[PDB]
DNA sequence: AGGACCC
DNA sequence: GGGGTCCT
DNA sequence: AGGACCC
DNA sequence: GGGGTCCT
């Protein structure tokens, strides 16, 4: 094809700006988000004083005690707000990509190659950069791929810039060549910075990296494995046997890691368009003996049915989660006709305690709506 | 909607019509198909001399000592005579869904109406089965039901005609209102025939059989799950608690079940289209103790890739099973990139001899191409 | 239905 | 924690 | 990856 | 047996 521009949308601190938009009064007092026992997320004013994300409420109350705390349990809010950004890049180039809430690929490849023919022999010696360059690194203005990236990140700024004057949302941006590299690149200047990396800094990225559970594609069960074999460092990864790699995780895993230790990543930038499931999670512990281990349910079966109701398009399979002591446990089943046509909650109720009893005879309960038509 | 016309075609003797057609020769000569050791399929010459289907090729010599063989092991050219029949249906209407390589339900609703449009007031008084009409029962000419019926029927022999007028093949069509009854009529008047089930015929066919194991949708295991119960006839099944039904196979399950008893069945037909997957198995036992184990392997994997190869599409995922002594297993993973671009055995070959280990430190070799794209 | 990854 | 993805 | 159904 | 389907 062959080489692409990507972009790594990445939003700072998303709940806690969501949280500051909603109270402004928040701004500049330092603020945390309480999901339960944890704050989940916070703010700058909060981070440069010590607090870290997943921290103990208490731990991260006696680190600050000025420290001010929102719930933020129930995630609709941020889940509107989550989509209005990715409705917003969508309309720079449809082919958008979410990782979770907060985050966003788009595929700048044919949009950059576009702005290249309003572009005459002249005006090609002016294109600037917009933006960190990673590792401070010259430009070329010669060097064809040093180019359209340099375009990509004006095409970020752009994002960025119309993120904030129409969600007023700050956040960073990576440009680079796949998606792997965008994404670790997005991060180097934060939080309200973009950075764009040229193709000859790339090991020097990787490079960067302390521990291979750093790159995106390994992680807890993964990292732990190689470590197991004495595999710590990023060139440990890219200098270990590939047979040695595949008799412990699989040849599927095995091929594609070796690969994201040399920055290689040729996954495509994925539409993701409308979600493939609505869900959610109460918790606890201990509790639930077992029922009102229905009550708990009933909640979540009017919350979703809300959600699943706005959508327009109709869930064909209700799915009930539990976990358990002291990975968790499901039982799906499709939805009947009669009832998919969408009171409503008592038929639903009696489908996932058939499912509950199949399970016990906890922890978390948890039901879900997916395959979506 | 709300009432369907459905049509199942179904083949006679498939197979060795294929043979018969093949070499003229064998045609009224007693024709089996050998797979393996087994007389697969036979004939109206030797089924009437009482071959039955799956009997042993000693059994079914012993019984009939004329009985001639054709070794029917490579499926190819069944499989591109079964695709002749089901494009030939899909140009009378488009829903076509096949069940396996002799079967079609086709969707006749949308057609039916149709033609009753060129339909005027007098000629709607002179519309004629063509065909039986299940259980001997009187048409009723002003029930709307039984019209559009008559009219599936018309089209059923209309497809039947066509496919022996260009395909040289004979076989048995249902019309009825879904496609349980459809298949389940079908069956009635056999070989050359066809059979028309008016809806107050359908208690009447329902209880005509003598095992839930004979209704579509209730197989060996499910059979077996009821019968221990106590649950032997269909109306066993028809009054049987939902509760206890529920308690043993599954809330999926048990809720469709009991209305296939009832002869209720809404499942859509579905455009099958091109197939999901290419697959090809080897048998044999004892034997493969383990290398060449893998020379099976390349057989399948040449074979496969011609048919992978005149397909157009590609496939990403390759798979390996065994089965072993004395339900298989599987081991799957994605094709690489560069080796999807379609020499291409060798490294095919290293993929799924990985696969193979990954077992074993068998009775049955195969290999399945499939996620088509 | 369980198990990897992302956040 | 409260969520989503896809592959087996 | 294993397990139901159809042929 | 030599094949295909979809759901968990
Ligand atoms: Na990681
Ligand atoms: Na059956």
Redesign the pocket.
């Known amino acids: 094809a062959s080489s692409r521009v990507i972009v790594h949308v990445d939003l700072d601190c998303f709940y806690a700006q969501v949280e500051m938009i909603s109270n402004p009064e928040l701004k500049d007092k330092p603020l945390g988000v309480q999901?339960?026992?944890?704050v989940?997320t916070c703010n700058y004013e909060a981070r440069k004083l010590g607090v870290k994300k997943?921290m103990n409420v208490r731990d991260a109350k006696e680190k600050c005690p000025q420290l001010v705390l929102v719930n933020g349990?129930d995630?609709t809010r941020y889940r509107e707000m989550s989509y209005k950004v990715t409705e917003l890049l969508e309309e720079f180039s449809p082919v958008v990509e979410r990782?979770?809430?907060?985050?966003n690929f788009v595929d700048l490849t044919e949009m950059v190659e576009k702005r290249l023919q309003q572009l005459q022999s002249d005006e090609l010696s002016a294109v600037t950069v917009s933006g960190h360059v990673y590792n401070n690194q010259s430009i070329n203005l010669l060097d064809v791929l040093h180019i359209r990236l340099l375009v990509g990140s004006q095409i970020a700024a752009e994002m960025r810039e119309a993120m904030y004057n129409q969600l007023g949302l700050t956040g960073c941006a990576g440009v680079a060549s796949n998606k792997l590299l965008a994404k670790l690149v997005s991060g180097v200047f934060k939080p309200n910075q973009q950075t764009v990396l040229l193709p000859e800094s790339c090991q020097h990225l990787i490079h960067s990296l302390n521990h291979i559970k750093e790159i995106?594609?390994?992680?807890?069960?993964?990292?732990k494995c190689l470590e197991a074999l004495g595999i710590n460092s990023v060139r440990d990864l890219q200098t270990f046997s590939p047979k040695i790699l595949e008799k412990e995780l699989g040849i599927?895993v095995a091929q594609r890691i070796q690969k994201l230790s040399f920055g290689e990543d040729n996954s495509p930038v994925?539409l993701?368009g409308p979600?493939?499931?609505?869900?959610?999670?109460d918790?606890f512990?201990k509790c639930s003996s077992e029922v009102e281990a229905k009550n708990k349910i009933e909640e979540l079966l009017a919350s979703l049915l809300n959600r699943v109701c706005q959508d327009g398009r109709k869930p064909h399979?209700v799915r009930l989660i539990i976990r358990r002591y002291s990975?968790r446990?499901?039982?799906?089943?499709?939805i009947p006709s009669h009832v998919i046509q969408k009171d409503v909650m008592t038929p639903m109720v009696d489908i996932l305690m058939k499912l509950f009893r199949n399970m016990v005879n906890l922890?978390l309960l948890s039901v879900?709506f997916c395959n979506l038509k």
């Open positions: 999901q339960k026992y944890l989940v997943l349990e995630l990782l979770g809430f907060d985050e995106p594609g390994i992680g807890y069960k993964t990292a599927s994925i993701s979600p493939q499931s609505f869900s959610e999670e918790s512990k399979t990975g446990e499901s039982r799906q089943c499709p922890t879900c």
